[PDB]
């Protein structure tokens, strides 16, 4: 099967650079772009930037282009990003992910602890975290900064990610269930406005959700919401 293979962890000075590796197997990593991600509590997920392997082309978020270097060697099917210059902001988990909805992939994530004990489209997530009772409604609105729609089509999807596991996505273009998912999740909305709803929750589906656009370079996303089990 198509695998993103990430290590688990590194623990780094500041003032270093850390070199992450994402190895590929299952396709031809030649043939698709690959992107990295970071993932903080505070901020979500930050899409760093992209390469496409064939030929090593990079595009960067401009926030990045001093911290991160991607690169890809194609002999061995494994992409790179180099952290430099560390600093405590850079502590953070980083995945590698192939982003568009249709081929969608995510790496483990490698969590980056760097440790010395001494007009971008903007989308707001309402609520941030929520506990719902099991068979209840849990109902999370997205809302962007500036339209995400083109030709009647929004270009955004949601991401799930439960406890322990990788992102995967979850609904494509607003209100398409991806392959696999339940029909007790549903999207709805375009322009500015979304919204996810899940009913009736199970256990499962205890998870951070994430809103995302790629209408617009940089693609952003959400700062995520936490929805947990209310215990009866
Ligand atoms: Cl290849
Ligand atoms: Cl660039
Ligand atoms: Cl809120
Ligand atoms: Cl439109
Ligand atoms: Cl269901
Ligand atoms: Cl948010
Ligand atoms: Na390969
Ligand atoms: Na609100």
């Known amino acids: 099967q198509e695998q993103l293979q990430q290590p688990g962890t590194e623990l780094v000075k500041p003032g270093a650079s850390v070199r992450l590796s994402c190895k590929t197997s299952?396709?031809?990593?030649?043939?698709?772009?690959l992107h990295w991600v970071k993932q903080t509590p505070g901020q979500g997920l930050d899409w760093i930037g992209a390469?496409?392997?064939?030929?090593?082309?990079?595009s960067y978020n401009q926030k990045f282009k001093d911290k991160a270097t991607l690169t890809a060697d194609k002999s061995s099917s494994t992409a790179y990003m180099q952290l430099s210059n560390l600093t405590s902001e850079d502590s953070a988990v980083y995945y590698c992910?192939?982003?568009?909805?249709?081929?969608?992939?995510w790496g483990a994530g490698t969590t980056v602890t760097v440790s010395a004990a001494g007009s971008d489209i903007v989308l707001t997530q309402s609520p941030t975290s929520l506990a719902v009772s099991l068979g209840q409604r849990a109902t999370i609105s997205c809302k962007a900064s500036?339209?995400?729609?083109?030709?009647?089509?929004?270009?955004m999807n949601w991401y799930q990610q439960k406890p322990g596991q990788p992102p995967r996505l979850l609904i494509y273009?607003?209100?398409n269930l991806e392959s696999g998912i339940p029909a007790r999740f549903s999207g709805s909305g375009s322009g500015t406005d979304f919204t996810l709803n899940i009913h009736p929750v199970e256990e499962e589906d205890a998870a951070t959700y994430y809103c995302?656009?790629?209408?617009?370079?940089?693609?952003?996303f959400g700062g995520g919401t936490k929805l947990e089990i209310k215990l009866e």
């Open positions: 995302q656009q790629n209408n617009e370079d940089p693609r952003t």
């Open positions: 299952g396709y031809t990593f030649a043939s698709y772009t």
């Open positions: 273009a607003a209100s």
């Open positions: 500036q339209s995400v729609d083109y030709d009647g089509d929004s270009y």
């Open positions: 992910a192939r982003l568009d909805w249709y081929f969608d992939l």
């Open positions: 390469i496409y392997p064939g030929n090593g082309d990079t």
